[PDB]
Amino acid sequence: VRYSLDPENPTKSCKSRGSNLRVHFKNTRETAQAIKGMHIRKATKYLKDVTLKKQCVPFRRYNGGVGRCAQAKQWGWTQGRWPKKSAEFLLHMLKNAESNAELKGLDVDSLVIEHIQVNKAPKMRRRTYRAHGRINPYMSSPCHIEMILTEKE
RNA sequence: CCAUCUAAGGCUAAAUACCGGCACGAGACCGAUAGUCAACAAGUACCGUAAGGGAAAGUUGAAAAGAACUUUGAAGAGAG
Ligand SMILES: [Mg+2]
Ligand SMILES: [Mg+2]
Ligand SMILES: [Mg+2]
Ligand SMILES: [Mg+2]
Ligand SMILES: [Mg+2]
Ligand SMILES: [Mg+2]
Ligand SMILES: [Mg+2]
Ligand SMILES: [Mg+2]
Ligand SMILES: [Mg+2]
Structure with missing residues (x-):
C-alpha cells in the first residue's frame, strides 16, 4: 500500500499503518496532531499519561x-481532553x-515521528428510534491511520 | 302498372386477424439511474389480515499465478 508522504530516505525510516480502526476520527486526529513530532519515548510517555489523565490533548x-x-x-490552548481509546490505539500502532524498526535493524532510541495522518474510513450503520415512529441513523466514524518514524539525533 | 328475390331449416375451404404459446431470423433501437419490474439465487428479498404492493444488485486477472515464509500484536490489523 502507498503512503501519502514518502520518507526522505527509506533506509533510516520505518512505517506503520492501520485501517478501519473502530475509534472516533476526530478524537484520533486531535491526539495524532498532539504527537506530531515528538521522540518515540516522549510520545509513548505522553500517551500513557494521557491515559492516566496526567496530560491533556488540546482540541483545536x-x-x-x-x-x-x-x-x-x-x-497554549484552553480546551483539552483525555481520549484514552485513541491514545491506546496510537500506542499499539507505535x-x-x-x-518494525527493530526488525529493520534501526536505532530504536533515536526515532522521531516524521509524518502522521488520520483519514476517515468507510462508515458503518446502526439504527436509533425516535418519537412518532421515526428512525434516524446511528453511524460510527472509524479511521485509517498511517505513521512514519525516522532516525534523528 | 313495372322490376327483383323466395323468409321464418342446414353444411361449406381460400384470400383475412393474432401484444398468449413453440421454434427461429433481423435492427440507422437501449447500453446497467438506460432497455422489460427483472442482464445477477426477480415477481426474489421485503411490506400489508387480505385484495395487493415490490426493489437494490454486472466488470480482479491472459492465466488464481488469490500473496509460501520471517517478524509485532490476543486479534482485527501491519512491516518485510
Ligand atoms: Mg454551542
Ligand atoms: Mg428513542
Ligand atoms: Mg410505534
Ligand atoms: Mg328457403
Ligand atoms: Mg339459408
Ligand atoms: Mg355456419
Ligand atoms: Mg433480412
Ligand atoms: Mg456505469
Ligand atoms: Mg465497478
Missing part, C-alpha cells in the same frame, strides 16, 4: 462544546512501528 479544530481544562495551558 474539532473543539465545539469541548470543556476547558487546566492542562491546556502547557499547550509499538508496531517500534517492532
